[PDB]
Amino acid sequence: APSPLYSVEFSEEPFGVIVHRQLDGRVLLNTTVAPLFFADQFLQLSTSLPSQYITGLAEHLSPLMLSTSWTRITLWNRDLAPTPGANLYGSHPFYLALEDGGSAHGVFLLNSNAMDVVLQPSPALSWRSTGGILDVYIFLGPEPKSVVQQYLDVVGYPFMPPYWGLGFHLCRWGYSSTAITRQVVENMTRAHFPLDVQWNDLDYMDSRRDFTFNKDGFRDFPAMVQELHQGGRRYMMIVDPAISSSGPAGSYRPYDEGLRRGVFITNETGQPLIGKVWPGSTAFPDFTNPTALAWWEDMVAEFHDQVPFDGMWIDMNEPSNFIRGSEDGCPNNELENPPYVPGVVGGTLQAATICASSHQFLSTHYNLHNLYGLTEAIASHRALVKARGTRPFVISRSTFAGHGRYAGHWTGDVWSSWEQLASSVPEILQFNLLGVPLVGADVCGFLGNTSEELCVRWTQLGAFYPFMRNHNSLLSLPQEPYSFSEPAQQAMRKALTLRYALLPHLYTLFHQAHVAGETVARPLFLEFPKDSSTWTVDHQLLWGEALLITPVLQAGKAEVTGYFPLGTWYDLQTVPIEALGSREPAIHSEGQWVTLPAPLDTINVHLRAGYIIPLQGPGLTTTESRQQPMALAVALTKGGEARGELFWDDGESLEVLERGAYTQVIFLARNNTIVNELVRVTSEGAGLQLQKVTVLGVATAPQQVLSNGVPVSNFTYSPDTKVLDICVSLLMGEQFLVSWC
Amino acid sequence: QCDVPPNSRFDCAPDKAITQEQCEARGCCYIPAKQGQPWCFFPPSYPSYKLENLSSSEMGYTATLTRTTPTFFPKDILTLRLDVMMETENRLHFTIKDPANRRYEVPLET
Ligand SMILES: *[C@@H]1O[C@H](CO)[C@@H](O[C@@H]2O[C@H](CO)[C@@H](O[C@@H]3O[C@H](CO)[C@@H](O)[C@H](O)[C@@H]3O)[C@H](O)[C@H]2NC(C)=O)[C@H](O)[C@H]1NC(C)=O
Ligand SMILES: *[C@@H]1O[C@H](CO[C@@H]2O[C@@H](C)[C@@H](O)[C@@H](O)[C@@H]2O)[C@@H](O[C@@H]2O[C@H](CO)[C@@H](O)[C@H](O)[C@H]2NC(C)=O)[C@H](O)[C@H]1NC(C)=O
Ligand SMILES: *[C@H]1[C@H](O)[C@@H](O)[C@H](O)[C@@H](CO)[C@@H]1NCCCCCCCCn1cc(CCCCN)nn1
Ligand SMILES: *[C@@H]1O[C@H](CO)[C@@H](O[C@@H]2O[C@H](CO)[C@@H](O)[C@H](O)[C@H]2NC(C)=O)[C@H](O)[C@H]1NC(C)=O
Ligand SMILES: *[C@@H]1O[C@H](CO)[C@@H](O[C@@H]2O[C@H](CO)[C@@H](O)[C@H](O)[C@H]2NC(C)=O)[C@H](O)[C@H]1NC(C)=O
Ligand SMILES: *[C@@H]1O[C@H](CO)[C@@H](O)[C@H](O)[C@H]1NC(C)=O
Ligand SMILES: [Cl-]
Ligand SMILES: [Cl-]
Ligand SMILES: [Cl-]
Ligand SMILES: [Cl-]
Ligand SMILES: [Cl-]
Ligand SMILES: [Cl-]
Ligand SMILES: [Cl-]
Ligand SMILES: [Cl-]
Ligand SMILES: [Cl-]
Ligand SMILES: [Cl-]
């Protein structure tokens, strides 16, 4: 029946907006609960919440479900190693609120000013902003997945990454030559560890300047990167926002050209604001200035003509300042000293950043600070499209709402600790809810020294981060997979092998994010919201609808206890996976906690009954893996049914969906048959070979297995595991029928 | 007037440390917590905005909001415009703005 899902009414005095869910009459928003404040530098709007269960308001180190016990959450982008109760690198003024029975709604306050959000146990929320206007969106769901899709209809669907971006990335601060960088690739290859992307940190630079490389350790930088490409790998390197202002005039084009075109944030007298970062004295590009976007595009394209890098790692883009405000301090005005200062670390908006009253093209830094990182990610996305002519790959530290339309994220300077390993699961899930699915933490941790046991568990869990990079700080012990004992290497190689086998599935999950605003890594409550036991689960994750990951997140554990929603969950260890180098088969759950064996060499992964997963053969790169034959894993319901899909394209071209340059196939199991349904077949995906079908939950040994009506060359049935393993010679792009009886 | 359940008290001194006398001078309620919860909080009669001239549009509603008593913050905007937009079956959108001055707005594509 045609009607909105919401009804709206107003209180006259005191003023309030009241929003009901029409279907059940539930009050979702009621701003009558507290006074409306609207002063030049202080806005406050309050509401009742429908339950104690609320998620969002990144970026903070906390449980997925936020505490309503008098919690003050501060949104002010800040360079700080993740720690509880602190404003960190990004700001996302969006929450999703759960309602008794499993419906949900979302609220987005489109405001980029420093703000506090105060949660209290009535339960209620107060938005407190230091500027701008109140611009509020309410998303009625009713399903939590639909709330996220509706939010992303406003801020942007996630960008489609290149296929190679889903491979393993390896980085550290301290690879101080091309000779050392080449040895990392050699050492990974020798020990049969997949590696798609070699990174460098600031080591490559000449005197710590952007768009340079030193003529000592990195003299042959262009050749190193050309050689990586010849072997089928990609190359990434750090780019900082701040531009060295100290060099002789005419000797450093990024500063000289930036000055000519007026690209920099300026101060009260109209000159560049000068801060301190790696190069020493630096100016800060204004990425709200159209001329700065043109200058950045030129600097990136010119540097790419010297060194053909495949993407940009943009760090320090809060913007981060080693000193407070500027080398010349900050003036005494109401922007630098506002009447309400939110709960920021350091108790001032200037701490670890630039003056709030500094000038940008669109407004003052006071209003635009929380967009700085986002504006650099947009500038860099555009620069990479123009320089390379294929899909960009931007990984950004600082973020704002809508970031995921342009770039990915990593959670920053996490400690090599069991606590930070455990904390990474809620943070990766939170960024998926916020439309930044290309997210992960530094595998084995960034700060301090990892242990072998921690790096095994972190690699196991980190193989299920949508963005998987091992990165390490300058003063840390090495933590490359090849640096550990043989048994630890075997466990890390198994985790990377399983991730590579699942890349066709992970890529299809990114396709659904990009076309339909879906999540890639998702909490159990998004998939089973009507089961209230899922609401507080944040140490397990799903990939899409079907793959449940239950990691060990503590030292000395050989088991883990996880929640299994009602249904059958097949142990993925019953699916054969080919590796280049060296327990119940099914959980029948009523909706309950289950203790699983989890020795050091194991991470628990279960496949939900009713789902089909596409898999691909092994490689040390996606260049190799993408040429391999494919396999299906078919998880049957009790009733013999399953469904899945595969999205395939060339893995890097722009405008694939608009041009139709892709293959899309649906798989259906019913009545002892497996078929494909061809949604779209083109030259990209036409050659895809299917050589193996594994069927889980086959109750009795078949007497015959047919492919297109003819007995297959070979099959195995395991009566202990109920697994039917079938050898076939089929094409994803041509209609087939596999059957058994 | 000050009989507000502890969990439903909204902070009337979010800006500074306040005394009972200063709290009561703002027209707020002072009740120490028994052991966080604000000690200084708004009574239900604390001055807010009043809705005036609510009007129906094809997209939803518009109104004027008027504050008669200043807050303890400087530069209250005493006259605001409310716009309510029923954009889709799933999406409701409202803005509160200063009708006399363009204020900073986050750049956002339609
Ligand atoms: C706005 O930014 C500009 C930089 O773009 C600031 O210019 C700086 O002004 C200070 C003095 O106020 C200069 O310091 C002086 O240096 C000279 C010699 O180097 C020394 O003899 C003086 O005793 C003093 O230390 C500084 O050189 C200059 N920086 C540059 C790069 O030129 C300007 O102050 C900023 N305006 C405001 C109001 O903050
Ligand atoms: C509430 O609105 C009334 C009436 O405004 C008029 O009708 C509206 C639909 C719109 O078209 C306006 O432009 C009209 O002026 C306002 O009362 C009027 O105030 C004006 C200006 O002071 C005065 O000339 C009229 O005589 C008033 N008319 C009446 C019938 O009283 C009123 O000010 C608005 N309230 C607020 C708080 O803005
Ligand atoms: C960003 C990212 O988080 C990491 O993954 C990267 O590996 C890091 C390196 O690129 C990067 N963070 C680097 C942080 C450096 C911290 C420096 C602390 C500054 C203290 N300081 C400096 C000064 C004087 C100014 C000197 C200017 N050179 N005073 N205090
Ligand atoms: C929205 O919140 C307001 C304020 O909390 C509620 O209004 C109060 O309701 C109580 C209890 O019924 C009354 O005794 C008060 O007089 C009301 N205050 C005001 C200012 O009117 C209101 O019930 C809530 N609306 C809905 C639909 O839940
Ligand atoms: C790549 O692996 C090689 C071989 O293991 C490493 O070189 C050895 O490193 C040890 C230090 O632990 C030295 O004492 C040996 O002399 C080295 N052996 C050889 C054969 O040179 C090398 O350090 C690794 N490089 C990187 C970048 O990981
Ligand atoms: C990491 O190990 C190195 C080498 O023993 C040591 O110097 C350093 O202090 C360690 N760091 C921490 C934080 O323990
Ligand atoms: Cl809770
Ligand atoms: Cl419903
Ligand atoms: Cl302008
Ligand atoms: Cl402005
Ligand atoms: Cl429970
Ligand atoms: Cl438990
Ligand atoms: Cl064929
Ligand atoms: Cl007192
Ligand atoms: Cl006061
Ligand atoms: Cl005033």
Residue numbers in the entry:
A (entry chain A): 204 to 785, 794 to 952
B (entry chain F): 81 to 115, 123 to 197
Original paper wording:
We developed and applied fluorescent activity-based probes reporting on either human GH30 lysosomal glucosylceramidase (GBA1, a retaining β-glucosidase) or GH31 lysosomal retaining α-glucosidase (GAA). Gaucher disease is rooted in genetic deficiency of the retaining β-glucosidase GBA1 (glucosylceramidase, glucocerebrosidase, member of the glycoside hydrolase (GH)30 superfamily of glycoside hydrolases)10 and Pompe disease is caused by genetic deficiency of the retaining α-glucosidase, GAA (member of the GH31 family). GBA1 and GAA produce glucose, but do so from different substrates and by following distinct reaction itineraries. However, and as dictated by the opposite (compared to glucosylceramide) anomeric configuration, it does so following the reverse reaction itinerary: 4C1 → [4H3]‡ → 1S3.
GAA processes its substrate, glycogen (α-1,4/1,6-linked glucopyranose polymers), in a related Koshland double displacement mechanism. 1,6-Epi-cyclophellitol in turn is a mechanism-based retaining α-glucosidase inhibitor. Substitution of the primary alcohol in 1,6-epi-cyclophellitol for a reporter is not an option – inhibitory potency will be lost – and the same holds true for any of the three secondary alcohols. Ensuing copper(i)-catalysed azide–alkyne [2 + 3] cycloaddition with TAMRA-alkyne yielded GAA ABP II. More broadly speaking, the work described here also reveals that substitution of the Bodipy-type dyes we routinely install on our cyclophellitol ABPs as reporter entities, for the TAMRA dye (commonly used in FluoPol-based assays) is not detrimental for probe affinity.
